[PDB]
């Protein structure tokens, strides 16, 4: 579409901007996939975590 052409003209008339764009995309996508996998991991198996044992503080 025209959005692809707009993005092309905005970002790629130089090269250092391209390098910065790649680095930023990497260090955003990393965080996004981390959040997604952590959330799915939490959802899959509820009740088994370390903060879910009912007797965690009764050996004083």
């Amino acid at each position: 579409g025209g959005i692809f052409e707009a993005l092309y003209k905005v970002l790629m008339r130089r090269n250092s901007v391209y390098v910065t764009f790649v680095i930023a995309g990497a260090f955003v996508g990393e965080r996004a996939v981390d959040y997604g996998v952590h959330k799915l991991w939490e959802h899959n198996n509820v009740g088994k975590r370390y903060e879910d044992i009912s007797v965690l503080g009764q050996r004083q």
Partner: peptide, 29 residues
């Protein structure tokens, strides 16, 4: 010299951004 100076400015900016990210690596920035 001006296009070359600003090209060097942009390259220095890329390098400085990467080095700053090396110094502090904030997960949720």
């Amino acid at each position: 010299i001006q296009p070359t100076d600003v090209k060097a400015a942009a390259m220095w900016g890329v390098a400085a951004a990467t080095g700053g990210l090396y110094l502090i690596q904030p997960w949720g920035w």
